[PDB]
Design a protein around this ligand. Structure first.
Ligand SMILES: [Ca+2]
Ligand SMILES: [Ca+2]
Ligand SMILES: [Ca+2]
Ligand SMILES: [Ca+2]
Ligand SMILES: [Ca+2]
Ligand SMILES: [Ca+2]
Lengths: 428, 428
């Protein structure tokens, strides 16, 4: 959520910055609600005061007939409860609006309508020239018997996979390599997190209220009927960022750099048509996430650092990619600035997204009440949060299989992964 | 499900074997339903025949007024549809009974009422004598800051954990070691499986119809409204065993030995009281599963082999345990014979279940229609299925932390795990 006082003080300026995302801030409705809120707030607080006073008058005469006084306190209590509910319903209408507002893009972000307006910043490696017709990862999967989509339709349904044997081992090897890289060389602490999360968590990172439809939701448990409305995690950004919810972190302890290897679950609503075949656009997919909790003045530097960490995975793996600065119109909900790394995909003859590194500014920190404090001063302030994949494991497996395929369909194991595969050079 | 002809031919004998589990087979109701089924079946099949014949009489005269004949075929079609529905409702009542019948215990299984009647077969290693008061894994978790239950209550709710740092790394190290042991030394092929499964899968391994309440269920997706009634996997036995559903496997290709590392999800319904604190009885927990698909005559040998594989993990890790032959009254629904490995838990001053290895006989194979065929003969037969954990990773972490704790709370890394931890000797 945006700073409420920034919406109060200069709403036309924030609406202008938000218009660059293609978002129309309803400034008039927000104002009309806010003006009614002050009227209800003065009435409620006056009722609270007079109920508190009449309650004290009873206990004073009780020591000294507490009946005509007792009736009045019940009439005021009825009045105050009605007043408080009426105010709360209005507070809930303001929240419906405020919490559906995307983040203000930082001035570094190029102005754009959509993905066609994204700016290329960097490019690394040169796409492989093949001496045969390139096979896709699905075709190679079938040749090895290692990627079985039909078995996953049988166990579950569409947009699921069963990996079998050496290709399943290679997928594990990729995740191990990424976790070891970030924990051993990049200063990230490793975490095992729940894959089911509550509504507070989802509100905290921005999935709720606007993106409930993107999630798999669980039915409450009979023995936890009022505390088990859970959703499956769509990214480890959700559990990891929420670890600092309702915390005051000493600035000396920042940055907090966390990594996790988890499955991610997406309903893929609206994706009716785009990427029907393959490990791309799945309901279930593994990712090795990087999350940073930093001091407000270090977030821009941390973004460059984190993007560099995801780039390092691609470079060590010998996978050519392009680095893209996302424009105002192609950014995710919580982000103020984003870099997407797009890996070369031989069968698609283009680069495809494999990492999306974002600086969230204080947008999630405000929702979570995540703040920091220098012991030197009497001043707490919201932290900045960042997240990015290093990398989407399923998409890395696609890029690896396709870029390293041999004429006969064998997969060459990238040199940096051979220690993770007992020195094995080829699958097949 | 049990063989329908074994229920038809000798129901008093199967009811006798089932009574040893403490299960009363309603032989009288099954018989009454079966007698009505034959009456409805003769009526339906007679209606099917006469509708088929009257339909053919139309097409014969159509070549040669197809109106008094067309009315009759519609009256018979109405009659047949009603007859078929009435029969199907009765078929569904037989299924409600047949599919809630547990497996017949094998004669090897000792007769018992409950867990207090289980027979100890073997014992390995000697429980450690400590020179200080033993701390539990929760206390050690807190000392290291590596096991955070409060953070998991915040992200989700109770019976969840957040593992942070070195203890999170050690948990990953355990799973890697188990997967490497079974794939490199024990002949298991590695698999990546969906963590969400459909109703057919659940019926196949026996979770449905009787144990829906033990599961986390997902709400159907709007864009898959009639094909996304999924549940979270409670064990990898569910997706792995179901890979052979509707298959005729060449006997030469058996045994099919599969392993996976997955999170497992349990609602823990009825567990109100038992194990309130710790990594024991969680809603989410990791397991390294072993599943075997074998020829009917090799299942008993495969059980001993598989139990030995789970024992090997414990022996290499230097964790003392006891091997227990479960009695008739303490077996799981699908099992005909089971061995439980119970690991020594210093803070509990007892052995606790860490693996449950079962021979399922043809019980799941019958539900899944999983069969094998020798090319030499014109004879298909149901395969036998087996499953067991090698091991429950969370429970291994508990046993490791507690058995290897040092006076100051440091955790000694078992010698066999040090290569998985970059040679690290101690955590802390
Ligand atoms: Ca510091
Ligand atoms: Ca994007
Ligand atoms: Ca974001
Ligand atoms: Ca063979
Ligand atoms: Ca048991
Ligand atoms: Ca079983």
């Amino acid at each position: 959520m945006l700073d409420p006082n920034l919406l109060r003080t200069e709403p036309d300026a924030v609406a202008e910055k938000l218009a660059r995302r293609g978002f129309k801030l309803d400034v008039d409705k927000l104002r009309a609600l806010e003006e009614r809120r002050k009227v209800l707030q003065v009435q409620t607080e006056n009722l609270q005061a007079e109920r508190n006073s009449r309650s004290k008058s009873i206990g004073q005469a009780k020591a000294r007939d507490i009946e005509p006084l007792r009736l009045e306190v019940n009439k005021l209590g009825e009045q105050l409860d009605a007043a408080k509910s009426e105010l709360e319903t209005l507070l809930a209408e303001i929240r419906d609006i405020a919490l559906a507002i995307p983040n203000i893009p930082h001035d570094d972000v190029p102005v754009g309508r959509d993905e066609n307006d994204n700016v290329e910043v960097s490019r690394w490696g040169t796409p492989r020239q093949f001496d045969f017709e390139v096979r896709d990862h699905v075709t190679l999967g079938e040749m090895h018997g290692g990627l079985d989509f039909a078995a996953a339709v049988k166990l579950t349904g569409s947009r699921f996979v069963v990996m079998k044997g050496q290709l399943a081992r290679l997928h594990r090897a990729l995740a191990q390599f990424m976790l070891d890289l970030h924990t051993e060389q990049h200063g990230y602490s490793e975490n095992y997190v729940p894959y089911l999360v509550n509504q507070d968590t989802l509100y905290g990172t921005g999935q709720l209220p606007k993106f409930a439809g993107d999630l798999f939701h669980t039915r409450p448990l009979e023995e936890e009927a009022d505390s088990s409305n859970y959703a499956l995690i769509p990214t480890a950004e959700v559990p990891l960022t929420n670890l600092v919810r309702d915390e005051i972190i000493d600035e000396d302890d920042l940055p907090i750099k966390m990594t996790a290897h988890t499955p991610c679950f997406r309903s893929e609503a609206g994706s009716y048509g785009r990427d029907t075949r393959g490990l791309i656009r799945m309901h279930q997919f593994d990712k090795v996430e990087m999350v940073q909790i930093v001091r407000p003045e270090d977030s821009m530097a941390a973004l460059e650092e984190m993007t560099g960490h995801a780039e390092k995975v691609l470079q060590l793996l010998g996978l050519p990619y392009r680095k893209v600065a996302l424009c105002t119109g192609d950014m995710g909900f919580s982000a103020c600035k984003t870099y997407d790394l797009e890996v070369w995909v031989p069968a698609q003859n283009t680069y495809r997204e494999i990492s999306s590194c974002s600086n969230v500014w204080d947008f999630q920190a405000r929702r979570m009440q995540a703040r920091c404090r220098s012991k030197s001063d009497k001043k707490t302030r919201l932290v900045h949060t960042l997240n990015g994949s290093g990398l989407a494991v399923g998409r890395t497996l696609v890029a690896l299989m396709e870029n390293y395929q041999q004429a006969d369909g064998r997969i060459e194991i990238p040199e940096v992964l051979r220690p993770y595969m007992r020195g094995l050079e080829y699958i097949g």
